[PDB]
């Protein structure tokens, strides 16, 4: 499958793509404002994620740091990134269908639209000013709005026992972005697309 990743933000981001134990395609790249990066993700990939990283510094070997979404200090990510990260999540060719969502379970850093470029399903978006409105206790100094599990490390926010309810903090993310997961047991906002669809992830879609 093809994913086109587009930076419509006015600032540079460092896109990342991983399935947790491996890079997808090159795994990461700098995107200046307006740039597009096309990657190829193998059919059958389960548990892939795409995210943006902000305020990164990398040397000539591809090592460095980012203030949001850092993946072990690498430009080309082979594992998932440090919160806060708005996440585009997908599993492809699962019994004939692809499944896509946006999640705020690991917080929010950059607004996002995740849409198919082929026909048969709709896209999803979280483009509200979550960072500007972020509750004081969730605000990350490096930028972004953390989720409550990252900040407080309780069974209730992290849903560790498999039973948890919504919280004041999850309801904040849900009020601003209804179409994104706000906590682990949120009613699913996953979209079912035909198997082998192609997609576009746009950062700052309303920029």
Q: How far is the CB of 96 from Na ion (least distance, A)?
A: 27
* Cβ-count burial 174-200 (b if 16+ within 10 Å, e if not): bebbebbbbbeebeebebebebebbbb
Taking alpha carbons only, the member of 138, 137, 79, 78 closest to residue 109 is 138
Q: Which is nearer to Na ion, 103 or 189 (CB)?
A: 103
Q: How many CB atoms lie within 10 A of CB 4?
A: 14
What value does the CA radius of gyration of the chain take, rounded to a whole number of Å? 16
Q: How far is the CB of 130 from Na ion (least distance, A)?
A: 11
Q: How far is the CB of 97 from Na ion (least distance, A)?
A: 23
Nearest residue to Na ion, by Cβ distance, number only: 106
Report the distance separating Cα 161 and Cα 165, nearest Å. 11
Chain residues that interact with Na ion, rule: CB under 5 A: 87, 103-106
Q: Which is nearer to Na ion, 93 or 190 (CB)?
A: 190
Paired tokens of 99: 């499944």
Q: Which is nearer to Na ion, 150 or 196 (CB)?
A: 150
Q: Which is nearer to Na ion, 68 or 103 (CB)?
A: 103
Q: How far is the CB of 86 from Na ion (least distance, A)?
A: 6
């Amino acid at each position: 499958a093809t994913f086109e990743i587009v930076n419509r933000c006015s600032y540079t981001v460092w896109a990342a793509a991983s399935k947790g134990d491996a890079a997808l395609d090159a795994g990461g790249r700098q995107l200046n404002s307006g740039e597009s990066w096309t990657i190829n993700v193998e059919p059958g990939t389960n548990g892939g994620k795409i995210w943006a990283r902000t305020d990164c510094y990398f040397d000539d070997s591809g090592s460095g740091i980012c203030k949001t979404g850092d993946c072990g200090g690498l430009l080309r990510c082979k594992r998932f990134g440090r919160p806060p990260t708005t996440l585009a999540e997908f599993s492809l060719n699962q019994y004939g269908k692809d499944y896509i969502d946006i999640s705020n379970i690991k917080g929010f850093n950059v607004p996002m639209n995740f849409s198919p470029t082929t026909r048969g399903c709709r896209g999803v978006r979280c483009a509200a000013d979550i960072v500007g409105q972020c509750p004081a206790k969730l605000k990350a100094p490096g930028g972004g709005c953390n989720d409550a599990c990252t900040v407080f490390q309780t069974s209730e926010y992290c849903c560790t026992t498999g039973k948890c309810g919504p919280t004041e903090y999850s309801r904040f993310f849900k009020r601003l972005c209804p179409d994104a997961f706000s906590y682990v047991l949120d009613k699913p906002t996953t979209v079912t697309c035909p198997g082998s669809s192609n997609y576009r992830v746009t950062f700052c879609p309303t920029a």
